[PDB]
Amino acid sequence: RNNFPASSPERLQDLKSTVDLLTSITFFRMKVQELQSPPRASQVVKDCVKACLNSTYEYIFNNCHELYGREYQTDPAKKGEVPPEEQGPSIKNLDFWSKLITLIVSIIEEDKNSYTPCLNQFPQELNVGKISAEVMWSLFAQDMKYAMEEHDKHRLCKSADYMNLHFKVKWLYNEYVA
Amino acid sequence: ELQVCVKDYCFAREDRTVGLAVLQLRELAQRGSAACWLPLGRRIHMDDTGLTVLRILSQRSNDEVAKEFVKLKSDTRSAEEGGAAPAP
Amino acid sequence: FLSKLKDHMVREEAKSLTPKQCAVVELALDTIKQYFHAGGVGLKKTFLEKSPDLQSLRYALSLYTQATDLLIKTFVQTQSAQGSGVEDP
DSSP states (O other), rough: OOOOOOTTTTHHHHHHHHHHHHHHHOOOOOOSSSSSSOHHHHHHHHHHHHHHHHHHHHHHHHHHHHHHHHHHSSGGGGGOOOOHHHHOOSSSSSSHHHHHHHHHHHHHHHHHIIIIHHHTTSTTTTOHHHHHHHHHHHHHHHHHHHHHHHOOOOOOOOOHHHHHHHHHHHHHIIIIOO | OEEEEEOOOOSSSSOOEEEEEEEEEHHHHHHOOOOOOOOBBSSSOOOHHHHHHHHHHOOOOOOOHHHHHHHTTTTOOOOTTTOOBOOO | OOOIISSOOOOOOOOOOHHHHHHHHHHHHHHHHHHGGGGSSOOHHHHHHTTTHHHHHHHHHHHHHHOHHHHHHHHHHHOTTTTSSOOOO
């Protein structure tokens, strides 16, 4: 994602030609070095994708505010380095989580939409949009469960706010994850 | 059988397996209810047939039950903070 | 096959004994049994069928086709020693 941003079709093509080169190397190992079980080009890449997705998740879960901030935030004064207790989870509000929901959506979209087509060489094995949705939800759901448990001890947001969050989460799961 | 796993909760990182214990529900079929202190291991201990069934189930690498079974038996303590390999 | 899908060594599917290679072997074995029987000149069909060597071979073969739940039940019923004291807790 960082090395071949979707915003550069040229680096998406160099990316495509890179995976064509990596198939060409796997094929050299298989054919010229005559190796019997060289690293399979789809699994090699799937690791790299999982890697890039997990780096994405870590970075979003730690920097939710800076990211949601700059990428969408409904108040320009809230785009910057909001406190770490609001770039990761807040006990005061549910807004970090509404923000994290939108981050997750956006990434799964870019993966589904720019990268799944760029990286079609193993289409059967490598739906970048699905690998994205799974990885990101998994990492999310853990974090969200602990958050809701934490809110429950403090009850600083109103009942209503958690009901609103429930409809958003209900929607999100029932969209991407289910 | 119950498989009881202790894990360290780790946002940003990964939730490290601290240890694993197996309880056979054959025992409970007599006991009805049991208080027990399960000692935790680093990996589950196996015979040739467990290891044969496991290598067979791992070839069913699209069956979700097999995947989760294989994954679950193949869970071991992420070694660190107190050690890697157990005894059987 | 420890190495290629019990163990960590290769992200290959190992390729099981496939239904066709389960057959072929089960038929090779019936032929070997007929050979060792040699129309009564060799070993009795009864010794050969009761052969623990053959029964063991058949058992291992039977595992390679068995259903996921049945493999899992087999695991729980066989791994009885996963319930009598962890060592190095």
